[PDB]
Design an enzyme around this catalytic site. Structure first.
Site, PDB file in Angstrom:
ATOM      1  N   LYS A 109       0.847  -1.184  -0.122  1.00 50.30           N
ATOM      2  CA  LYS A 109      -0.133  -0.025  -0.094  1.00 50.30           C
ATOM      3  C   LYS A 109       0.747   1.315  -0.039  1.00 50.30           C
ATOM      4  CE  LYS A 109      -1.972  -1.772   3.627  1.00 50.30           C
ATOM      5  NZ  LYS A 109      -1.941  -2.907   3.666  1.00 50.30           N
ATOM      6  N   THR A 147       4.272   1.672  -0.327  1.00 57.49           N
ATOM      7  CA  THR A 147       5.110   1.682  -1.636  1.00 57.49           C
ATOM      8  C   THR A 147       4.398   2.403  -2.711  1.00 57.49           C
ATOM      9  OG1 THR A 147       5.916  -0.428  -0.784  1.00 57.49           O
ATOM     10  CG2 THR A 147       6.957   0.347  -2.980  1.00 57.49           C
ATOM     11  N   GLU A 174      -1.848   5.808   7.133  1.00 55.61           N
ATOM     12  CA  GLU A 174      -2.495   5.144   8.030  1.00 55.61           C
ATOM     13  C   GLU A 174      -1.647   5.372   9.394  1.00 55.61           C
ATOM     14  OE1 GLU A 174      -4.094   1.150   8.180  1.00 55.61           O
ATOM     15  OE2 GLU A 174      -2.329   0.822   9.162  1.00 55.61           O
ATOM     16  N   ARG A 196      -5.716   2.953   3.493  1.00 55.44           N
ATOM     17  CA  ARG A 196      -6.658   2.140   4.241  1.00 55.44           C
ATOM     18  C   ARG A 196      -8.078   3.379   4.638  1.00 55.44           C
ATOM     19  NH1 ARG A 196      -3.593  -2.197   7.046  1.00 55.44           N
ATOM     20  NH2 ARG A 196      -3.319  -3.657   5.626  1.00 55.44           N
ATOM     21  N   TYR A 244       8.840  -9.944   6.572  1.00 59.78           N
ATOM     22  CA  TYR A 244      10.243 -10.457   6.930  1.00 59.78           C
ATOM     23  C   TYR A 244      11.308  -9.726   6.172  1.00 59.78           C
ATOM     24  N   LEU A 245      10.754  -9.243   4.663  1.00 61.50           N
ATOM     25  CA  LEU A 245      11.488  -8.357   4.086  1.00 61.50           C
ATOM     26  C   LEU A 245      11.273  -6.734   4.341  1.00 61.50           C
ATOM     27  CD1 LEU A 245      13.511  -9.201   1.731  1.00 61.50           C
ATOM     28  CD2 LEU A 245      11.520  -8.524   0.037  1.00 61.50           C
ATOM     29  N   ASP A 270       7.406  -7.522  -7.529  1.00 60.27           N
ATOM     30  CA  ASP A 270       7.963  -6.398  -7.445  1.00 60.27           C
ATOM     31  C   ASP A 270       7.593  -5.297  -8.121  1.00 60.27           C
ATOM     32  OD1 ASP A 270      10.051  -5.945  -4.798  1.00 60.27           O
ATOM     33  OD2 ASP A 270      10.621  -4.416  -6.631  1.00 60.27           O
TER      34      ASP A 270
HETATM   35  C1  LIG Z   1      -0.189  -4.765  11.613  1.00 60.43           C
HETATM   36  C2  LIG Z   1      -0.174  -4.323  13.069  1.00 60.43           C
HETATM   37  C3  LIG Z   1      -1.540  -3.952  13.667  1.00 60.43           C
HETATM   38  C4  LIG Z   1      -2.252  -5.490  14.280  1.00 60.43           C
HETATM   39  S1  LIG Z   1      -1.171  -6.167  15.289  1.00 60.43           S
HETATM   40  C5  LIG Z   1      -2.214  -7.425  15.553  1.00 60.43           C
HETATM   41  C6  LIG Z   1      -2.167  -8.489  15.855  1.00 60.43           C
HETATM   42  C7  LIG Z   1      -0.934  -9.165  16.572  1.00 60.43           C
HETATM   43  C8  LIG Z   1      -0.992 -10.206  17.150  1.00 60.43           C
HETATM   44  C9  LIG Z   1      -2.315 -10.977  17.429  1.00 60.43           C
HETATM   45  O1  LIG Z   1      -2.130 -12.138  18.242  1.00 60.43           O
HETATM   46  C10 LIG Z   1      -0.985 -12.582  18.500  1.00 60.43           C
HETATM   47  C11 LIG Z   1      -3.628 -10.494  16.824  1.00 60.43           C
HETATM   48  O2  LIG Z   1      -4.673 -11.327  17.003  1.00 60.43           O
HETATM   49  C12 LIG Z   1      -3.539  -9.347  16.029  1.00 60.43           C
HETATM   50  N1  LIG Z   1      -3.135  -7.368  14.379  1.00 60.43           N
HETATM   51  C13 LIG Z   1      -3.063  -5.870  13.735  1.00 60.43           C
HETATM   52  C14 LIG Z   1      -4.130  -5.603  12.520  1.00 60.43           C
HETATM   53  S2  LIG Z   1      -5.447  -4.772  13.436  1.00 60.43           S
HETATM   54  C15 LIG Z   1      -5.370  -3.236  12.580  1.00 60.43           C
HETATM   55  N2  LIG Z   1      -4.308  -3.038  12.248  1.00 60.43           N
HETATM   56  C16 LIG Z   1      -4.516  -1.691  11.390  1.00 60.43           C
HETATM   57  N3  LIG Z   1      -3.549  -1.516  10.342  1.00 60.43           N
HETATM   58  C17 LIG Z   1      -5.728  -1.121  11.326  1.00 60.43           C
HETATM   59  C18 LIG Z   1      -6.647  -1.192  12.063  1.00 60.43           C
HETATM   60  N4  LIG Z   1      -7.732  -0.796  12.061  1.00 60.43           N
HETATM   61  N5  LIG Z   1      -6.757  -2.524  12.816  1.00 60.43           N
HETATM   62  O1  LIG Z   2       6.643  -4.157  -5.353  1.00 59.81           O
HETATM   63  C1  LIG Z   2       6.895  -3.836  -4.044  1.00 59.81           C
HETATM   64  C2  LIG Z   2       6.260  -3.549  -2.930  1.00 59.81           C
HETATM   65  C3  LIG Z   2       6.657  -3.621  -1.580  1.00 59.81           C
HETATM   66  N1  LIG Z   2       7.770  -4.164  -1.326  1.00 59.81           N
HETATM   67  C4  LIG Z   2       8.445  -4.144  -0.091  1.00 59.81           C
HETATM   68  O2  LIG Z   2       7.363  -4.788   0.787  1.00 59.81           O
HETATM   69  C5  LIG Z   2       7.371  -4.491   2.024  1.00 59.81           C
HETATM   70  C6  LIG Z   2       5.761  -4.208   2.537  1.00 59.81           C
HETATM   71  O3  LIG Z   2       5.332  -3.020   1.681  1.00 59.81           O
HETATM   72  P1  LIG Z   2       4.698  -1.472   2.234  1.00 59.81           P
HETATM   73  O4  LIG Z   2       5.478  -0.902   3.393  1.00 59.81           O
HETATM   74  O5  LIG Z   2       4.240  -0.762   1.138  1.00 59.81           O
HETATM   75  O6  LIG Z   2       3.555  -2.648   2.968  1.00 59.81           O
HETATM   76  P2  LIG Z   2       2.318  -1.932   3.684  1.00 59.81           P
HETATM   77  O7  LIG Z   2       2.312  -0.424   3.694  1.00 59.81           O
HETATM   78  O8  LIG Z   2       1.072  -2.444   2.853  1.00 59.81           O
HETATM   79  O9  LIG Z   2       2.421  -2.754   4.790  1.00 59.81           O
HETATM   80  C7  LIG Z   2       8.357  -3.222   1.992  1.00 59.81           C
HETATM   81  O10 LIG Z   2       9.495  -3.806   2.720  1.00 59.81           O
HETATM   82  C8  LIG Z   2       8.575  -3.033   0.402  1.00 59.81           C
HETATM   83  O11 LIG Z   2       9.886  -2.512   0.566  1.00 59.81           O
HETATM   84  C9  LIG Z   2       8.656  -4.807  -2.400  1.00 59.81           C
HETATM   85  O12 LIG Z   2       9.740  -5.073  -2.218  1.00 59.81           O
HETATM   86  N2  LIG Z   2       8.211  -4.629  -3.838  1.00 59.81           N
END
Ligand SMILES: CCCc1sc(-c2ccc(OC)c(O)c2)nc1CSc1nc(N)cc(N)n1
Ligand SMILES: O=c1ccn([C@@H]2O[C@H](COP(=O)(O)OP(=O)(O)O)[C@@H](O)[C@H]2O)c(=O)[nH]1
Ligand SMILES: CCCc1sc(-c2ccc(OC)c(O)c2)nc1CSc1nc(N)cc(N)n1
Ligand SMILES: O=c1ccn([C@@H]2O[C@H](COP(=O)(O)OP(=O)(O)O)[C@@H](O)[C@H]2O)c(=O)[nH]1
Lengths: 230, 228
Positions: free
Chosen positions: A15, A17, A34, A98, A160-161, A211
């Site tokens: 998103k 990127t 976000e 989002r 992980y990347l 990519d």
């Molecule tokens: C990606 C970081 C935010 C997290 S952390 C998380 C999570 C982590 C551990 C969990 O169990 C170990 C779980 O059930 C949820 N879910 C989420 C997604 S919840 C969420 N994320 C958003 N980015 C926005 C939104 N409205 N709600």
């Molecule tokens: O074409 C792409 C798009 C994304 N990424 C990598 O994918 C990861 C997640 O991308 P981004 O931060 O946009 O994710 P989001 O905002 O959706 O969490 C980052 O480490 C980017 O460098 C990539 O290597 N190639």
């Protein structure tokens, strides 16, 4: 007059990127990142966010409601600030990373169906969400939704990347839950809502599984032809 | 529309002062407390449940309770500001306020370690935004302070005979009680809503039962309203 266009997609789908790619192509194009994305790190709203977000990881059933209400209140307010903050712009388009709708209908619906929100907590979340968004009328109403479709295995790779130590623990099945909900709400178009116009609101899908950082021109071409329909 | 808040400790008389006050003029109306309507619909049922949760695990439900209540207050005061359409000198009496919520209870849960710093400053951050987008005009033109002793209230909880309340311990009615005095007498507290520092206050000893005998209380109310 400023066109709102949310970008929807699973964790690490790309998103942000893509959003920072577009931002550079048009002074007529701006971004609203976000907050939780912002919080996912290493101002009071940050302090609070990394905190709640750290607490969310460690025990999600304790923390889900609070964190949802704060991810969403933090977004609503960040959204309104870019509107008052493309004034002169001839063809204004602002991109949301989002939406209030992804807050409620993917993420807060997931955690509820995955049992981190008991029912009282969910009806309160949803009540609170109705009342707050019927009170904006069409200020924050979306002209469009671009869906950044990908696969959960490419998102685990991307995670992980991306190297956020705390994001390393999120497993594939969870990613697979959020994939199932995006597919159904956007691509399949079935998931219901309490909002009128999100049935007659246009949706761009885009495969980001390869990519795209160096090779994004076709994706952008899609975005524009899409904005001229809206 | 004129806006007054009736504040005071639990079972101190607000609901009484208010069910009496609304009867004395067709120009007067009341917004009773959400929390008290929980003490049936998606508010009621969402309201009834968490309240009961909040008695069992307060260190786990005060954020959630403290958000829902303030919301439902904000909601209800707004659908009510609804009433008093054909009136010359219209007054709405608020059964407690958005500042009650915050600077009495929600502060008192924190001080009591039933919410944490994050929660408590998340609530603060939300209160400050949820009141400034939708709640600008719920702004009060005065306040009315029903003052019973921490002691008076506890017997008047028995009277009412609410089951889950008869568990409210005396020590609870006590800190709630020195916090009203601070905000509304000494003006020992300071809030984050400055027009509130210049809102007038009329305070009434309500240790004497006025279920038959409210005339002179009402007289100062009438009097206070005539000084706005
Ligand atoms: C990606 C970081 C935010 C997290 S952390 C998380 C999570 C982590 C551990 C969990 O169990 C170990 C779980 O059930 C949820 N879910 C989420 C997604 S919840 C969420 N994320 C958003 N980015 C926005 C939104 N409205 N709600
Ligand atoms: O074409 C792409 C798009 C994304 N990424 C990598 O994918 C990861 C997640 O991308 P981004 O931060 O946009 O994710 P989001 O905002 O959706 O969490 C980052 O480490 C980017 O460098 C990539 O290597 N190639
Ligand atoms: C009057 C019933 C609501 C409750 S319940 C309650 C409570 C119950 C058991 C407790 O310990 C187990 C406790 O520390 C508090 N405090 C309260 C007062 S907190 C409050 N009251 C309001 N009227 C409004 C508001 N925002 N917050
Ligand atoms: O002067 C009074 C005020 C109240 N009550 C009774 O005490 C109970 C609790 O008071 P209330 O609910 O009005 O207090 P609030 O919490 O609303 O301030 C009710 O049964 C009242 O009938 C009373 O006998 N005399």
């Amino acid at each position: 007059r400023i066109k709102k266009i949310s970008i929807e997609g699973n964790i690490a789908a790309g998103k942000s990127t893509f959003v920072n790619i577009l931002k550079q192509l048009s002074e007529d194009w701006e971004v609203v990142p976000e907050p939780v994305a912002r919080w996912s790190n290493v101002t009071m709203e940050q302090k609070n966010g990394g905190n709640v977000l750290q607490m969310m990881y460690e025990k999600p059933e304790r923390w889900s409601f609070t964190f949802q209400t704060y991810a969403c209140l933090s977004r609503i307010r960040a959204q309104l600030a870019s509107l008052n903050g493309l004034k002169d712009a001839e063809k204004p388009v602002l991109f949301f990373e989002r939406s209030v709708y992804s807050d409620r209908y993917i993420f807060a619906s997931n955690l509820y169906e995955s049992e981190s929100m008991n029912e009282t907590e969910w009806t309160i979340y949803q009540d609170w969400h109705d009342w707050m968004n019927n009170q904006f009328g069409q200020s924050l109403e979306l002209d469009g939704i671009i869906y950044l479709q990908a696969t959960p295995e490419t998102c685990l790779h991307r995670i992980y990347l991306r190297g956020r130590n705390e994001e390393q623990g999120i497993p594939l099945e969870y990613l697979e839950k959020l994939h199932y909900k995006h597919e159904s709400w956007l691509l399949h178009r079935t998931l219901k809502t309490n909002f009128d116009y999100l049935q007659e609101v246009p949706i761009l899908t885009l495969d980001v599984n390869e990519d795209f950082k160096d090779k994004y021109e076709s994706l952008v071409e899609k975005v524009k032809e899409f904005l001229s329909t809206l």
